[model samples]
Target chain A: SVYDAAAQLTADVKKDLRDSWKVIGSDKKGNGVALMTTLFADNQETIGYFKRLGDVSQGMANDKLRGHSITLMYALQNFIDQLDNPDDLVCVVEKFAVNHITRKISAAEFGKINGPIKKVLASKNFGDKYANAWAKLVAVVQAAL
Target chain B: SVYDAAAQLTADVKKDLRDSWKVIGSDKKGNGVALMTTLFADNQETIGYFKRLGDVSQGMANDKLRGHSITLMYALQNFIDQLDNPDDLVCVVEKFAVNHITRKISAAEFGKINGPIKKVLASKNFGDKYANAWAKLVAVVQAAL
Candidate 1:
């Protein structure tokens, strides 16, 4: 299924993805908060857009901010859902970018997200190989930028 | 669209509804905050279920609490989305109640939501008639309880 796409990801990558996504996606709301925390802590610029999330170090990465994080995780679920059909995935991803256009949020800025995502996954026991698969999946999605 | 079944909302209700929803839904994120605030302020008991939202007074109805509000408002959109088909609407509303089971949130508890929702709509110029339709629609959803 991994070979089917525009990203040309490997079967191992899919295995890696499926293996990790089951865990991460299972707890989207909580993991979404973790993902957002990683993003803000790693990339200072992210706080500018999501200032409501509050400061990360000052114990201000409030769970309330994770509310919007719910949307992103659902978005992530779809990207994984269509992994077998990158054609559909592209369309799905384009719509994701459409929200960015609405918010004047640069899709390119999210390129920074890949690192934080992988880091959070690693913390979740997802290894580098699994992280590699995520990077590729995200890069393909970011291609729309 | 208001002539539809289940809730039996009248044309005036829908007109008032569509009239106001366009604005409220237009800015779901920000307005979701207001909708949530109204919920907590009007119904003190609701804060017990959603303690993370912080206090309604003393400036604790922080925008951060509005995150979960996003889900509630989107749920509001879906209730409206199927207004044209009450048969389908019943099934859709059923799934909504299902979420309550997960959290042990009583469907009857949401009966309180109708009041807050109507109040929010009225604040947005939705008019009494449109607010009436929402009350009816919410009652219909609660019927599944």
Candidate 2:
């Protein structure tokens, strides 16, 4: 039942998510790449895990980090597009989970990104209206991860 | 040059159309049905042509007109989604043109609906910012029809 609540996100929640995402996602340079880097910044221990991303201290300009930032942006767009359809959302996230497994990503590691994402939204003035919606989405994503 | 102008709608125009459409299409009973009925009301000669729809004066409660209204709404949504890609939009509208031909519908008859559709959009407060976009769309759809 609790899971269904996440899956059956109300139209109001979906609208809030869409409105917030549009603003945050408008700029790949300052917003999109910044959001992913924020995730790394918030989780210092997790920063070491991106072995392929050489010299994380250099931040968003790192080639590998930029690649991953684009990937994250696309993944988020796909996730938002399918929010209205629970079955499709599960199908998409399950595929993401399988992909993460090959990368040796833990559920906790995957879950850590939620904080920075919300912080980015709050910076854009999305406020608490979308806080609960993001929490629901993060929970679902964490469970699958 | 004219063809290029029709085919090359800007992203801002596409976004405007998408945003306005989301509201206009949100209400199937009011906006959707009313749009199709507006076409018929504008062209009284067209009302007798829908053999499937009975009692043209009876309004949205008419089942056959309701079916056609929903069909029209889907077609318009699909059209708007392909705005940036003219080849795809042409392909889609061409199919619609062929369907209209099968029903003995002329370009003139098909073109009449644009006024009412714009009226509906204006009522929704879409305003003139999207006027050029709609005009471009109407030109393409008319050409195809």
Candidate 3:
């Protein structure tokens, strides 16, 4: 039941991000969240995926690292796992995006990996223990990149 | 040189976590910081191998869903390449252990995985990306598992 609950939430989060993550112009940095997640989680494919996506200008908004990088996959998935209630997942991600990603990283910076990540963790979310081990995986990058 | 930098950092950080990362015999929920580093970075074989080195009193951590639940071979090697100042890699791992892993999760919660993964990484240090990638190639799990 726990796994299923998380899986369902992860799937939904992915769908939500898919709808909202694209920028629609030209940007390339690398997903900030994805990179951070990879840094914390030790995921290669996910990190490489975000790096490749950032290179391609998944949408727009400038620097891919700021918001649209694909590394959000780790954060999204972890958030999903930590949730006791599914509905709160969306609120948590949105808040994380606005406060953590947006406040510190520029739109361009946020767009790096944040832009194309496509998921909120309420939909097919997943991350290793190390992935969610940090208090704020994306926080460090938010302040810097 | 690049490889050494990262490898050395990994070793040093783990040592630091063991020697200095504690207060009242507890650091970050009784896990010093290396647990997050290894679990996030290790593949299956690597994770399993490392666990065998420690005593049961140390406890263990695991994330079955993680792509590289067994070994951190690739993750450790990749880190060397990613570092701008390879020699100072240990500093990076030090902060990661203290801030991220220790802050995010505990050893018992992490299971069969700990921070010394960098040590294994350090031993195998080589100045090539392909080698690092190759080491991790066999660790493919999760999506490809």
Using lDDT as the measure, which candidate wins?
Answer: 2
Model 2 per-residue lDDT at B72: 57
Look at candidate 1 and give me any clashing residue pairs.
Answer: none
Q: B93-143, model 2: which lDDT tens digit per residue? A: 665665577778777777777778787888888777765567666666567
lDDT of 2 at A50: 77
lDDT of 3 by residue, A1-145 (tens): 2233333434444443333233210111234433454332433334443442354332323333433332233344334333444333333344344434433545345434432232322122433322232213233223333
Please give the DockQ score of every candidate, comma-separated.
0.03, 0.02, 0.06
Displacement of the residue B16 alpha carbon in candidate 1, Å: 30
Tens digits of per-residue lDDT for model 1, A49-98: 76544554433234335435645666676566566665555655665565
Candidate 3 chain A weakest ten by summed lDDT: A20-29
TM-score ranking from best candidate downward? 2, 1, 3
Task: Flag clash pairs in model 2.
Answer: none
Which stretches in model 3 have alpha-carbon errors above 4 Å?
A10-12, A18-145, B1-81, B85-90, B95-145
Instruction: Output candidate 1 Cα RMSD.
Output: 16.1
Q: What is the TM-score of chain A alone in each candidate?
A: 0.82, 0.86, 0.25
User: Could you give the DockQ of candidate 2?
Assistant: 0.02
Which runs of model 1 end up more than 4 angstroms from their true locations? A1-7, A52-64, B1-145
**TM accuracy, model 3:** 0.24
